[model samples]
Target chain A: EQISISSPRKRIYHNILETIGGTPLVELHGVTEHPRIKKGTRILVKLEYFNPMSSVKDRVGFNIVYQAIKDGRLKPGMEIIESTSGNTGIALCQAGAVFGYRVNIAMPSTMSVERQMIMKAFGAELILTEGKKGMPGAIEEVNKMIKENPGKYFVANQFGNPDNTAAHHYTANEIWEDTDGEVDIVVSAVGTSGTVIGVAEKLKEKKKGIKIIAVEPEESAVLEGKAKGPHGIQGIGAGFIPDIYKKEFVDEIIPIKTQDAWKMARAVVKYDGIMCGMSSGAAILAGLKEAEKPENEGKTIVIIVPSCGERYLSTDLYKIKDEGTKIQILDSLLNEH
Target chain B: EQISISSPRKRIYHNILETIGGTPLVELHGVTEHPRIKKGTRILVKLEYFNPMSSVKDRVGFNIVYQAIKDGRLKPGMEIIESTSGNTGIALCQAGAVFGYRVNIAMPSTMSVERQMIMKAFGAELILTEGKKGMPGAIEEVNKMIKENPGKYFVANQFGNPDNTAAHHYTANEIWEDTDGEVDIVVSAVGTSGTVIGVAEKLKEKKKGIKIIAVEPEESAVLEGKAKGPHGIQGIGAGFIPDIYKKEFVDEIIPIKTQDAWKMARAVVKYDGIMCGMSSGAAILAGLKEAEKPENEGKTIVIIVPSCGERYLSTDLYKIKDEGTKIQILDSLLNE
Candidate 1:
């Protein structure tokens, strides 16, 4: 393909909206596939962690805010509020700061200290909603705040926001066209269904047999077809089925426990040195699971891991280390010894 | 140009050699003067932070280790060690860990807590030399360790490593070729002077008119034609003149103060949202200074930012909020 894009060799800064995409597509060399799945088994994990906010949520953040402003729901100087685990809050804070808007983020009190501080560092107001009560309480509080303030406050409700889908639809899908439409399957977690449904819809249109797989928190059984709670992977999992999730489009769904996903997340850092959030770890689990499945045999699968895991170190994820609790060692490590 | 190189996919990691180079090139919209220097004025920053160890030093670290191994100075299980401030130590730790080699890094006790822990997290043995005594003391301690256990260690000796320069000469030079030779000037801070001298030598060979400007801490007067004490921009300024710096290749040298370099480093995070190391800040300052110089005017200048500032959160450069006492606060209630 002859390259049409010319390299920019001049000074440029349009208020930092220019620093979003162009993520690296990395081949997953370290993943060991089962013999049943060896039929043309090639998996590529895109490092969207390379974004300015160090996550794909940057796109969602910009899209949600942009849509709200366009719809006249968000006015200048009005407090933009949202309930998030960490990445969404950080991205919203970053987008908010850049656009001259005040932000109020409602996060689980169990969220990491670094996350709260980082959001605060960007001048975003943070409301910690209790650790044990979980994110539902935080969501409830955010909903109440929106009602309490009425017109003065606006929520960039990402889980249902159409712009969230449009972002991956227009931008990420267009870039993936270089893959020659050979991408047979899409594996990703379904928090908002924005990534899987949005990008998956575009890719599936390119090819009919494109398998769409969704990985969700084992505890949060609230996807298109699941039943569970206390899901820890932030920004990607919804306690309820998001409006965007089309149950018919999902070819397969895999539920990963926090314990299972976290082990892989750490190994990614230790072995590959690629530290990403829990959603990526869960997505990798789904990719591995789907590849091992009989229907998924002999197909090239692509999973969008979304972002890095540096933000998760703020929450209870590090407590196993801090409290000296024995962390569940991966099966490979157990076999090694 | 027709696309020839394909995207990077997964491959099994056999050794440390697989790690160097292949850094991501990102557009730096905030900085550049390309309209005057060439057909375009936009500059791009090759984010070497995506490297395994989070700095360009990994290139130097692996190259040095590889050379030592080929020369029989280092064996499979033998320990590789160096005296470093932060990034170099982390890089050596990563490079050594991959090849199934032991690593021990010596540093002054006064750097970031995260950096020390990150080194330790990689299972690298750390030797905390005296803090006020600075890096030279740690270097001296490594020398003594090598002497005591002769043949038991391969002290990378980065300052003296010819491969350090050779890596940049061979790899970075070719990477710069992608810039279309429009880079009329290459700017960098001289820590070990390897990257600056090596990259500059390659560029100068390609174009004799290419200007090479070196940045150093004003506190470290070693490159100022005067011998002085240690400097705070720990990665850039050495207390003494390094052996590898070929005085002929350096067309100009600028000594930026610690405060000014730190101010820019903070500004990058605050304004541009680009987190860069203090030494990289000094390099950018040098690049700007060279751009303003009469000889460098109308010439495209690119500076080598040594590393990102994430490693220096606890250092003087990232202590902006913590050191609020230094700032004069005008009370909001004063006029009211």
Candidate 2:
């Protein structure tokens, strides 16, 4: 456990803000021998939860803001605006605050109260969307805000942002280099699809034979020919697929269920103690599914975990406080198996 | 999103369980940059909750169990036993389950009932002690079981076990090495006191000038020449300090309240989206305090976050199920 020489301080921060990426990659060792897991399944998850903001969105948000600055769309003191379920908004607000920009966030009301407070803590102004509009209502408000203040407001359109994908390419290259090109498959769940497309493009460019696995909640499965249903949150189900999503980048898709994701998250906590985001739980569980495939046996898989679990304390996704309450988002999604 | 990799065929079993001490280390942005902090201060924490079994004890349990097996104290089929509040019990059970050993946990009845269910989930046995006796009662019962069984069972003596300290040593080295010696100070609250002693020794050995600041609940301000009192479940409290704790190991002690620790834990979730154990929260908050200190100017601090918030779900610690109830433990402990 000796410290590695890759210390963080040597990396320069512009004093505008401290950079958030470069989380240490740790080897997973606890359950590799479980009787249920297939043999030769070497599982390594990039602990992206260790990102500066406790979620990988820092890369997206930071890159988005940096690109905005570079493109002259945003100047110091201008208000930055974005629509997000949680992580992206918080990361943007943090980056904005550091760069001397005021931030305004539009998000669904049903989201965690803590998440809103986090954005507020970073000095971002929050605009809450009332009831069931889910994220659409938030998006509508952000669009209106952007339209109203075209000259003054800058929006970090994460769904269409090229930086969102580029961040993954940077991450993918680092991963490929770190493992010395031993990576067999890359697993990720699509929220905006930027991370998956971005990482996939880079890995394939590095080694054409490398595989890419996409995960989605069965309820919100959106890929062409993939099963679709109601995804729990911010991952996969906003309806229309972004034009920026490059289908050519992915090789396969695993539509996971709420039940499987929740069960695995709880099991992970009970075993590994990592309180991860619901989608991360789904991604890792989905990644493990490949280990069960006979053809993929003996290959190494890397699952990209996007965030930590603290954001989920207020959600009913897992660690159910009310088991008696009838709820099965997964049961209705017949394609979950 | 497109799937990047194709599914593989299943055949043989994988080797080691993946969740261990190599947890995620995240940055503290807004909170560390408060006006109270000194210029050039840097702060980061490891999300140890990611450790398999969800606590830093995962490493301790696996290490202890492996050592015992190597020493012949435990055979493949032997039953393992230990006294723990909860975290360590879960870790031991998980590691034992994988290594082909049955584990028995002795805990006070007051611990969340879910604890037993969690242990049972891993196919371990649970023996509850009388609630009135607190943790020591569980420890005493474990001692008795050890005496009775003699060579029949292997007990992980976590409090005094060198393995516990070694877990921290390994983690500290990796963390320091991971962050490269830019870490000027390390802050932590000691429960077994093993973490502070172990990490402090490693950091000091890495750099003689490195400072180790110890944090404790103000009510149980044992290191600050104050009387001991009831404290929360994670990190840096003791009915009695273990033999492993050494005075010189720590450079200073920061006294904090239980509610502050819990408050910071909640704040972390709200702000950084990081669910942290109570001691982990306290240590970071204490490091934040150091960053604010005039003497701490320009120094970068790394707090050894030992655990996460899930363990307190059953307790009134997080949301305060009752408004009239005291969020701070000392107000009740002192008044009583």
Candidate 3:
């Protein structure tokens, strides 16, 4: 007998952008399974890192350009600018590279060295701003670039952009269809809250009494209407609510601490074999927390994993060291030679 | 009418091991296209990085263990050992994690830190060997460990394993079915030569006169029977031929320079936006070279892209620099 049937896997993509959405809805086991939790309770993870650009931002990155060009706001080979130091920046660079547009990324110099290199490799110009101000400093540089160039530039401001919310419509529908419309509750980390807003809009309209939950860092729980100090979660909890983040869409917000998220991030990889990012780690913990609760028994919980851990290797999140694991180093044997 | 239909990608998998095969078959444009080349010629890249473990070796990793279990060779809690520092090691670690096996990886301490951390994270035990001996040093240590353990360890010796050849039976049929049996040529890098060996076996049996080409580092080209010194291209060209690598299956060997391979790897990302490793880079250049020739006018060329480029971030392959691009520094504004 044959090993497995020929599934044609993603079929054939004309370009990489065509392969953005349609990510796998992988079911979690072992990590989320507990004796206290009902056996019927299912946790479906929407692996967004499966996107060609390796993040959920690929949805926003591709759609913003697609919608802009369709609406006659952008011409071929026009310059695009953004203020991001993470997944969105990398996603935009690939989107730009494919569409043959000049992408200008204004990020803080102290942000991430590897992400900047990745963006540069995809032919995006980097305009580094002051590290003291963090995001706003980069935003100010983006504003300045847009102001000076006038008609020569367009900024796909993911934070306040309508296109950002529009992009995740694909994300919501994919979840709805993959689960065959059996989703009881949805959980995702709140970055711009675009995911929650877009997912809520479609799911709530499709069925009645569908609950939606958002996750944010305990340090910067802005949606709870109380902001705190700096947080380690890179993608989510941007310290301020975006212009597009509708409060009515979300039924609840779960605040995850940095260490707990990191612990779960490590646990999922070790236990469940899914190597994911801190935001995804945060989402998983929140979903598992809900899945284990008494009221949420036998319900379907969908967690949108925003990014992959491959990008976070150089960061403090994944410090390379023998963490009490068995690593017999040969550097000590240099004297033997 | 809608954006696109809900294809239900990958369906649902109980574990990550289920997502090994069925990687995306992406078509190339702009970069591989040429006026001198026939317009009818097509380049279909089998994107192996799309696998859950993110490499073509996931096929061999999953299958060897699968075959071993089916044949009653591997016990439920048995230990599976392998001497590898690359894709196979990472794949086996994930496979081990899923199957509840104790996977011990014997690797040179000089290998990739990120890759090592990834293997370690998947709960695989690392047995590091001397950096001076490279892979064989690790292999010697693996032999020592295996010999000492007696019946405790199960080595999925990929280079000489029958299951390694059997794994690519899926790869060959995927290529044939994807092209609807239109593939005139197949191009893949000769790592264990397993991919070429396995592919040629099926494609030839299915259709007569199917040309198979193998790629190797231009420097350490042992298959050309003209072995040179060490080279930068990893995963391919072990100066000595592998036991599983069948010479009769391969029609030709394309030797590629490490610099050219790196250049193409960078080009594929910047121009085509398909981020892939150097081994994949070598495959693409070779495929394009064959496709551009006059003899292969209206033929279809399928390239097996081995691994993703994310793993190579720290290596000299993907050094972080401005690279003549506009990069303003905020640290410079510290004095401002």
If both were scored by DockQ, which would come out higher, candidate 1 or candidate 2? Answer: 1
Candidates 1 and 2: which is better by lDDT?
Answer: 2
Model 2, B2-70: lDDT tens digits are 102101111111222443554545567645546556557777776566554456777778778877777
Model 3 residue runs over 4 Å out of place are A1-6, A318-337, B1-6, B319-336
Cα lDDT for residue A245, candidate 3:
92
Top candidate on TM-score is 3
lDDT of 1 by residue, B1-336 (tens): 111112223232233235356554443433332233332443445445545455778788777876777778888657898888667777777666555577899988875556666666455778999888877788889999989988788887778777888878753454366566677767778888888788877877788867777889888867779667656786777777887778898888888887777766654444444566788777766665454445555455566666665455435665455222112111110111
Comparing 1 and 3 by lDDT, which wins? 3
**In candidate 1, residue B275 scores what lDDT?**
60
Per-residue alpha-carbon lDDT of candidate 2 for residues A48-123, written as tens digits (9 for 90 to 100): 6645456788777877887778778888658888888768887787677656588899988877666765566455
The residue-by-residue lDDT of candidate 3 on A227-302, one tens digit each, is: 6678888799888889999988899999888876776677677777788898988898888888877899889999
Cα deviation in Å at residue B173, candidate 1? 4.1
Per-candidate TM-scores read 0.77, 0.73, 0.92
Looking at model 1, residue A276 earns an lDDT score of 56
* TM-score of model number 3, chain B: 0.91
The alpha-carbon RMSD values of the candidates against the true structure, listed in the order shown, are 6.9, 8.0, 7.5
CAPRI-wise, candidate 2 is incorrect
